[PDB]
Amino acid sequence: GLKAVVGEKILSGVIRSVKKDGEWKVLIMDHPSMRILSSCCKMSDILAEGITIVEDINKRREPIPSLEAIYLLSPTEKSVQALIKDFQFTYKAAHIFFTDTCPEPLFSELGRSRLAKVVKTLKEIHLAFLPYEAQVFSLDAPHSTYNLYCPFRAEERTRQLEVLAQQIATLCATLQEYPAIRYRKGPEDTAQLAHAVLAKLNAFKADTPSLGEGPEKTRSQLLIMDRAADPVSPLLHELTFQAMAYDLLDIEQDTYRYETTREKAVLLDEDDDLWVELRHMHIADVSKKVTELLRTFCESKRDLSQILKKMPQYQKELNKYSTHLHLADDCMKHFKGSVEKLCSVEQDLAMGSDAEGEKIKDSMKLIVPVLLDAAVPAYDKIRVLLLYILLRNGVSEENLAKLIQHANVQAHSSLIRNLEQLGGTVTNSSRLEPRERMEPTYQLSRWTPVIKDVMEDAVEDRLDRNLWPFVSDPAPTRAGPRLIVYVMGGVAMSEMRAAYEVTRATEGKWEVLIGSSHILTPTRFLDDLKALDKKLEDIALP
Ligand SMILES: [Cl-]
């Protein structure tokens, strides 16, 4: 998928293109650059291409003239000024690779340097995005929401749209696409980003006019949506394996930690093929499916005296089964009690109707118990309170104060009101509501992300142009078409799931990719909101 593509562009385009069978090389990097390759290609493949050690430019290093030195950097004044510094000899010579275009000014001061003397290679790969999953990308700019929507960064807003616009143009170019660009009409941001992307995509089209040609690739579309178009989805407690695990449990750097009969630290990425299989399933179908795949593997390899002897051999491939069997139980531990009670209240507020289908009569009566409960943590009370404010489509100033007070979450008053910075409606409307679906589901997972409706419509060529205009109408006349989706201000894990549900529904006709500046859990979303009315010099510039 995306990790295979990105991995190939690196291994073959950067490491293999410089390899000298007799010689070996140091690979030096800045933070953004090494987050990219680390996310797709493994150390074993890196070694196989002729690299002795990997380093980080930001840290002090030892001189090794004997070894030539590759650099893979983002073309920022920090990385370049740090590179120039290495020889003005910490190395004998060096092969440079910028992940994007190097601006005149930075290339000029580099020509007046001593480094220049021993520069052996100098290219630019144009590759600025993390392949998080097979079908989900990230631009590695968690500072993006803050730069676009905080008033203390009003002057950097436009620059942040230009940066993101470029990153999204190099995504298409990487996938050999020249897709029709579309965006949600009302918000100023979505339109501005869409036109920026076209202008920076037309650059790559001009250099390679054969981009996106074909009866199938000509039908590819890139949709741009703002967070405020569906501020409900990022708040909800999802009961699918992934969305549920990252939300309820503490999972950092994508690593799950628990104890066995001793200190296991598993990485939930795409080498773990069991994770790839379960990540999108309701919590209620996980238990069985794990045991269903066990009964296959264990008995497939298998008087049972000899089977006992061969247990150490299976133990490793067999632990990987116990891994997710346990993670599922853990999801269920955290779900019992308050949470299962919250979900009920949330789904009623999101759908606007109880399980029977009967419309909710008194939405206030529904939350009041949860809010005045001292045993429910603040962030949980806040998700319910925000869902209530969104259902009501705004709430009176005085009613908001009485709820914040009676709910006992006064210190977070800030983040609640900060939802108006994204375009959402808190006090006293630009939100899209998912169409109804007459399809059976579990009582606690009746909500479908807005973006799924949008994806299905884009695929079937029935997406309203009034709401989703094109920037350019397609000229009158992998191989299949792609639908690329970019949610501004973070993408929820239900929306990530929606991409896989729609892609599988078309049976391979369409590959639906979705991504954003960063990936969201309900908690990280509230933290992003909290920041929008603060001056924080720690947060990175665009
Ligand atoms: Cl149009």
Curated annotation (Swiss-Prot):
Entries under SUPFAM superfamilies matching the protein: Sec1/munc18-like (SM) proteins
Region (Disordered): 422-438
GO cellular component: apical plasma membrane; azurophil granule; cytolytic granule; cytosol; extracellular exosome; extracellular region; phagocytic vesicle; plasma membrane
GO MF annotations, alphabetized: syntaxin-1 binding; syntaxin-3 binding
InterPro entries: Sec-1-like_dom1 (IPR043154), Sec-1-like_dom3a (IPR043127), Sec1-like (IPR001619), Sec1-like_dom2 (IPR027482), Sec1-like_sf (IPR036045)
GO BP, sorted A to Z: cellular response to type II interferon; intracellular protein transport; leukocyte mediated cytotoxicity; neutrophil degranulation; presynaptic dense core vesicle exocytosis; regulation of mast cell degranulation; vesicle docking involved in exocytosis
Pfam families, alphabetized: Sec1
Keywords: Disease variant, Exocytosis, Protein transport, Transport
Tissue: Placenta, lung, liver, kidney and pancreas, as well as in peripheral blood lymphocytes.
Membership in a protein family: Belongs to the STXBP/unc-18/SEC1 family.
Quaternary structure, from the entry: Interacts with STX1A, STX2 and STX3. Interacts with STX11.
Clinical condition linked: Hemophagocytic lymphohistiocytosis, familial, 5, with or without microvillus inclusion disease: A rare, autosomal recessive disorder characterized by immune dysregulation with hypercytokinemia, defective function of natural killer cell, and massive infiltration of several organs by activated lymphocytes and macrophages. The clinical features of the disease include fever, hepatosplenomegaly, cytopenia, and less frequently neurological abnormalities ranging from irritability and hypotonia to seizures, cranial nerve deficits and ataxia.
Biological role: Involved in intracellular vesicle trafficking and vesicle fusion with membranes. Contributes to the granule exocytosis machinery through interaction with soluble N-ethylmaleimide-sensitive factor attachment protein receptor (SNARE) proteins that regulate membrane fusion. Regulates cytotoxic granule exocytosis in natural killer (NK) cells.
UniProt protein name: Syntaxin-binding protein 2
Organism: Homo sapiens (Human)
